[PDB]
Design a protein around this ligand. Structure first.
Ligand SMILES: *C(=O)C(CC)(CC)C(=O)Nc1cccc(CN2CCc3cc4c(cc3C2)OCO4)c1
Ligand SMILES: *C(=O)C(CC)(CC)C(=O)Nc1cccc(CN2CCc3cc4c(cc3C2)OCO4)c1
Ligand SMILES: CCC1(CC)C(=O)N(c2cccc(CN3CCc4cc5c(cc4C3)OCO5)c2)C1=O
Ligand SMILES: CCC1(CC)C(=O)N(c2cccc(CN3CCc4cc5c(cc4C3)OCO5)c2)C1=O
Ligand SMILES: [Cl-]
Ligand SMILES: [Cl-]
Lengths: 827, 828
């Protein structure tokens, strides 16, 4: 019950710089983009030795660019040996982030730097044995072209965004044309605040939607012998959105860039759907372009809707679908929208009033699903629509947390009958006039575990065997695994991935292969191909066989000791998991200083069975200097269901440190080497927020707090995020005050060397103001602080030298104010 | 010999806060504006006991408003005793007055007090009040704040003021109000609407001390009808081509930035010109019409090469309007007379206007009555006196200049106003020298290795009866300002009127029979006294003074304030360099103490002189009480030592100043062994913060810690008026700008922490935060450590009390933890 304090070696600034540079020079080989965005194409060669060819994006090695590759999948393997697939470069010598494909032609389409290029492979053209030459799509457009997409109905056409307007371009006939005329590149953003086909700030940052336009997958054939291509697009008007200024990166100018930030409780962009009808003749040449708008306003047809979360088309191009949220993000709706709801844009009220009357009353919005929750809707990428058997019906799979409190798959069948509302009557539609009735709603899955549907996780639907492959947490919340089940008569759930690793998978479109990117705490990332088989007596049953390795793991790195995943039964009635790094060369009869690394906000899990030696390598480096490192997933973090996540609704900042302290005390009572008299805390963003709350609330536990890019004041943060978790400010005056660390400056320590603020000066999410206004109050209240600014940096640290300076200063600060001999001398 | 190191008392944050709060809570009497802006008015009462009444502005006591007071000057005194004048309040109150106007003939005061503009009467034909007067609000229909009020000297019923960057006039009797210029629109954006009238732009306020941009003509021209014509000369600026930068808005919740016009060095200054507002008033005192008038030819033609309008006004009879004009490089000054006949009505119609051009004769011309040049720089000042016109062909005036000898001295000049060789009807342009007047005479009223003072209130008073000129100067010592007097007709020897042992700040009665002096010295706080002037009967030129009364009595030696010792040393540069030394309180024998060099070191200031330093630099004493040696040195470049001494760093800022500081620092160490050179800190604000960074960067051997407040890290970001005066245009001094800019030399900073501290007001308009942020950006590239403090609700100066307390607290804790204390020496 005494123990001696260990003190870390007190290196100088120059020495720590060298220590970090030398330890960073070890790794870096494994800082390269692992194979992803896989696609399987069949050879169809009876005599040839390969069944499929697989295309994928990958970084060849370290400083080389991200580009298209391919490997060859054999019909049979040597089951004695282990087949390592070799990577064939698809392209001849600007990274590629994503690519499009068209099965019927073999056309690839992709952006590489400023250019948009295309090649052909695996179509009627056949299969290349040599790298292809990327063919530049020529243009007359002055500025950069973003968001290229192939037209699935016709692979000669592409679309793209230029200066916030939608353009199309033919890659054969070389024709180029502008579809929307909503933005003027010459005017100021104060005057011209409109755009088309592009998601606004909040939708990119807070809902992971980047594109804002969608090709209709089928072409209506014209009497003339040509066709009609279509593009559904969103049109945003940001005029009423507040304009803030953020410091321009060219610091010599002494100027600030304006941008549209919908801070909480203020106006989001004004949104609507539009349709671009494009009449092409028999020669593949544009006859006309008719821009079309909704027959009535968006606010009438889609009452209560703020956000267009997701959108697309049905497989046959009959309807266009959309997933719509209300402002509070407690009501989700899936709505079908017929192209017949759109009429041409017409100035003349005589011509226009006629066009309104030409559309039938039966043609209506069709809300094919609706759900509510008293916690919040979490948007995801799962949504699959089966072919239409009957005109009166539509059949689909969707996921939801709303029923059970865990995300599970549901097969739903809705009825498409005429609306009680009729347009000729000249009234407004009632709240429930467009609701379709639910004929059927089978639960495909259930339990105390979630189906995953974000960050690449999705489903794959086998419509022959009538199965659905999906990722989930059924076996453990610490490991993602691939599963498969019947969607017709949902029996039991067959796990397809091996335990002991967490997996990130995708399934061949043909449903006879899958790939898994897997790792665990001890073993780095690894990518392997697996073949799927049916026992002849029962096609529902699924077994897998290892076929080949795509990327082989590095194996245990020299000097990386991984942590131990622990857990504890909390007083809150929840198992809370954690990671523990023991100090290297652990001296008996001595107690070491502790660093708590934290995030603790929603939509993130720091603790799981994945390799932490690439991202969180410096947690290990801290352990090598003699610091105990702890990481805990408090209440509110993901993969534990909606109830666990909802613990802090309206109450951010109030519960998170209670969990972190409980787990910190669990470890102390068990392991006597943890010195509770010298505990530091450090995080970024929500972690920086919680680090400030820690020092403010619990100065008894935490000696030092190093706050990364703190949210000090929730009124300054955007609509999409802070309203989802904390509601509208007028409906939660208490929670905003208590959740805002800037309002509680007097509660900070009146002794120095305990508070360190870090911030990227040019930050667009967590504006520097959060820090500057906190400082303003700390200065009023006579409180001490230390400050580091990264002047050429936004939220993340992209410039190498800044990242080195962060690491150096952080390691020297912990040393001189927590770990070392001189630290305890100061008191 | 090595001696033992003294370590300062290692107090906690909370304890230092208490220590600082206790040491300033004791005083607070010292933060009160001493009597100033004096004016003597004669009683003219044979039977009455008082000769003059004096009006002045003062702060009654501690946290009270600055307001008008008066005292009574007796005809005789009891020479046995000392008379203390009592302060009679002029005003009823029922805010704060920075300045006032007066009209002798009527008794009319005029002054702004917060939002309002008021007026009272005392000491005219009305007579003299024995009770406080009620200030009479000047009523208005103008929605926004009215600034820069001025009485019309030709008619005290009329005033003028600026409202939303346009000139207005208002009658305080008839209650009429009217706008004269229509140059600005309050509703438009500053990006579009970049014009103004009657207001000095940024650079002229900050770098040339001109705040007003309009000037009443002192006389009215009588009309045939029976009314009159009042005139107002004004400058009109167009800031359209001036660069627009963004400074963070004080309302930090908005996340926004105010636009403002900053003439970055090398770039465009505002486009300027003169204008005249001709105002026809009838016999009733009511406006008939207002004709706005412009220069018959452009400013760039009539005043070739001129960038800045430094100063302007009128001659005493209102015949000519004068102006003092600089070129861009500020190496050529010109005094120019401008007749109202040079101005013509503003007319859209090209036919009507072309006729009006021809109506003005060719003989009517700009008249450059003086011109001078220098290869160092012109320093602008407020001295310029014009005598009445005896002859039509001549003009006679006093002016001061450093251009002849290299020290500022007075000169009586007589110039000839002959017609110009250039003639306007010819339709050509004028040559450079076509408007130069010949100099008939140029007598030197003073000379020597010392300067006449003409800035910050220092001026001259001209006795036109006895033909004398009173002035402030450094003749006796560069450490003491003194009042002197001399003949301007037959300039003999100068008679010092102030006592030695104090530095003085004086003004002289308009009637030249009294003067007042605000004086102090290193041991004694500030004191304001009245002195009577007398002639011997045999010789009016000779002047003697007699003490008459005290206006503000000194507080006497403060409790706990030990003042410093002024020292000096012969520099290797061939200059005497003066300094100030604070010894540690309770000086132990055989021990060596940590030293703090407090510095400014830039141009136009002198830190070392014989004045009381216990108000503003009180906390230098507080540093001495904790056991720090404190040093302050005036290196080359600082003022009151002539132009050559000041010129030392032309094109070379940053290169020479630390050599002088180190030399004096080593003089003191070789003399006093209690200075520990192993623990020397440096601290300054603005140019001081700049030099603090240079000190650490250049001489890391000498300076352990550098604490830089609002540093100029990069001279290309600073304004036209200042940096071009001292460093020239960037393209003509690529070497000096690079070497003078600390941000371009970040690699030369220490690679070891606890040595560099940056302090900055986040909302600073002069030295924009970018100086710091861009320096940091380079320090981060080069892997260098720094400590940073930001005062988010603060501009260049610290106005908010809490911010000032946090500066003092953090500064004291920093020096403690990284220089002075026990723990400090362990950290290395
Ligand atoms: C700081 O923590 C933060 C919020 C105060 C600043 C932006 C933040 O949330 N940062 C952050 C950084 C990296 C990754 C994430 C997680 N990500 C947030 C947005 C998001 C949006 C959608 C989603 C999942 C995420 C997760 O699924 C659908 O939309 C957060
Ligand atoms: C920092 O030192 C500084 C320059 C980098 C920032 C503004 C600066 O010069 N500061 C400063 C603060 C207080 C007082 C002065 C001196 N003052 C400057 C302007 C000036 C203008 C005229 C003058 C005398 C001065 C002196 O006489 C005529 O015009 C400077
Ligand atoms: C952005 C989202 C997310 C979680 C998905 C998150 O939040 N972070 C996040 C935040 C801060 C820091 C780091 C990496 N850090 C680990 C801590 C540390 C500690 C050191 C050091 C470097 C580093 C690097 O040098 C010395 O001591 C990662 C994420 O990613
Ligand atoms: C603005 C122009 C001028 C010269 C007329 C100048 O330049 N300054 C100027 C600059 C910096 C600081 C101070 C006052 N300081 C003195 C140093 C000091 C040192 C302390 C402390 C407070 C202070 C206050 O607390 C602890 O240790 C004054 C001028 O004014
Ligand atoms: Cl089906
Ligand atoms: Cl005379």
């Amino acid at each position: 019950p005494k123990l001696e304090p260990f003190y870390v070696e007190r290196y100088s600034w120059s020495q720590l710089k060298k220590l970090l540079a030398d330890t960073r020079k070890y790794h870096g080989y494994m800082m390269a983009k692992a194979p992803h965005d896989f696609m399987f194409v069949k050879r169809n060669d009876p005599d040839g030795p390969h069944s499929d060819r697989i295309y994928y994006l990958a970084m060849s090695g370290e400083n080389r660019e991200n580009t298209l590759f391919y490997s060859e999948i054999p019909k049979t393997i040597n089951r004695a040996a282990v087949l390592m697939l070799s990577w064939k470069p698809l392209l001849d010598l600007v990274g590629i982030a994503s690519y499009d494909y068209h099965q019927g032609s073999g056309t690839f389409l992709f952006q590489a730097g400023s250019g948009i290029y295309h090649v052909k492979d695996g179509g009627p053209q056949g299969f290349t044995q040599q790298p292809l030459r990327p063919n530049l799509v020529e243009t007359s457009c002055p500025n950069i072209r973003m968001d290229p997409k192939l037209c699935p109905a016709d692979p000669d056409w592409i679309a793209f965004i230029h200066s916030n307007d939608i353009w199309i371009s033919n890659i054969v006939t070389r024709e180029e044309r502008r579809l929307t005329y909503v933005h003027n590149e010459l005017a100021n953003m104060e005057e011209d605040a409109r755009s088309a086909g592009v998601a606004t700030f909040v939708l990119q940052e807070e809902f992971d939607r980047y594109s804002g336009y969608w090709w209709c997958p089928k072409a209506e054939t014209t009497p003339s012998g040509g066709k009609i291509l279509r593009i559904l697009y969103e049109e945003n008007d940001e005029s009423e959105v507040e304009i803030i200024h953020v410091t321009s990166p060219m610091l010599e100018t002494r100027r600030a860039d304006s941008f549209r930030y919908p801070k909480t409780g203020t106006a989001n962009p004004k949104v609507t759907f539009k349709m671009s009808e494009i009449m092409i003749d028999a020669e593949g040449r544009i006859i006309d372009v008719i821009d079309k708008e909704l027959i009535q306003p968006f606010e009438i047809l889609f009452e209560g809707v703020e956000y267009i979360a997701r959108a697309g088309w049905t497989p046959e191009g009959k309807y266009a679908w959309s997933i719509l949220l209300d402002r509070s993000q407690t009501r989700l709706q899936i709505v079908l929208i017929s192209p017949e709801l759109f009429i041409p844009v017409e100035d003349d009220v005589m011509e226009r009033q006629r066009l309104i009357e030409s559309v039938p009353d039966s043609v209506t919005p069709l809300i094919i699903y609706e759900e509510t929750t008293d916690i919040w809707i979490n948007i995801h990428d799962i949504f699959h629509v089966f072919p239409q058997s009957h005109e009166e019906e539509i059949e689909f799979i969707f996921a939801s947390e709303c029923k059970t409190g865990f995300r599970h798959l549901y097969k739903i069948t809705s009825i498409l009958k005429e609306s009680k509302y009729k347009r000729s009557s000249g009234g407004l539609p009632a709240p429930s006039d467009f609701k379709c009735p639910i004929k059927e709603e089978i639960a495909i899955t259930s339990g105390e575990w979630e189906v995953l549907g974000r960050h690449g996780s999705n489903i794959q639907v086998d419509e022959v065997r009538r199965l659905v492959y999906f990722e989930g947490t059924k076996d453990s919340p610490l490991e993602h695994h691939l599963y498969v089940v019947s969607y017709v008569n949902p029996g039991e759930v067959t796990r397809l991935t091996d335990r002991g690793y967490s997996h990130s998978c995708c399934i061949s479109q043909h449903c006879d292969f899958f790939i898994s990117k897997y790792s665990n705490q001890k073993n780095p990332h690894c990518v392997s191909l697996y073949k799927l088989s049916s026992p002849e007596d029962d096609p529902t049953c699924k077994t897998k066989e290892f076929w080949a390795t795509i990327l082989d793991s590095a194996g245990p790195l020299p000097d990386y000791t991984p942590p131990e995943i622990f857990s504890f039964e909390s007083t809150t009635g929840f198992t809370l998991y954690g990671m523990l790094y023991k100090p290297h060369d652990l001296q008996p009869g001595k107690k070491y200083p502790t660093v708590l690394f934290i995030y603790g906000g929603p939509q993130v899990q720091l603790v799981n069975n994945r390799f932490k030696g690439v991202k969180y390598f410096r947690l290990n480096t801290l352990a090598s200097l003699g610091y105990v490192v702890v990481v805990i997933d408090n209440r509110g973090s993901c993969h534990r269901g909606l109830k666990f996540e909802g613990a802090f609704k309206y109450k951010m900042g109030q519960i998170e440190i209670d969990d972190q302290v409980e787990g910190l005390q669990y470890l102390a009572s068990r392991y006597d080497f943890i010195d509770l008299d010298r505990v530091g805390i450090h995080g970024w963003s929500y972690g920086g927020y919680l680090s400030l709350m820690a020092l403010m609330q619990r100065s008894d536990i935490f000696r030092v707090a190093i706050a990364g890019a703190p949210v000090t004041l929730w009124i300054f943060y955007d609509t999409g995020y802070t309203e989802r978790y904390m509601g509208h400010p007028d409906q939660n005056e208490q929670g905003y005050y208590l959740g805002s660390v800037a309002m509680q400056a007097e509660k900070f320590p009146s002794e120095p060397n305990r508070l360190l603020l870090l911030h990227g000066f040019l930050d667009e999410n967590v504006h520097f103001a959060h820090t500057s206004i906190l400082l303003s109050f700390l200065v009023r209240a006579g409180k001490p602080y230390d400050l580091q600014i990264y002047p050429q940096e936004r939220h993340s640290i992209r410039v190498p030298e800044s990242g080195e300076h962060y690491e150096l200063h952080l390691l020297h600060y912990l040393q001189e104010n927590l770990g070392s001999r001189i630290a305890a001398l100061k008191v």
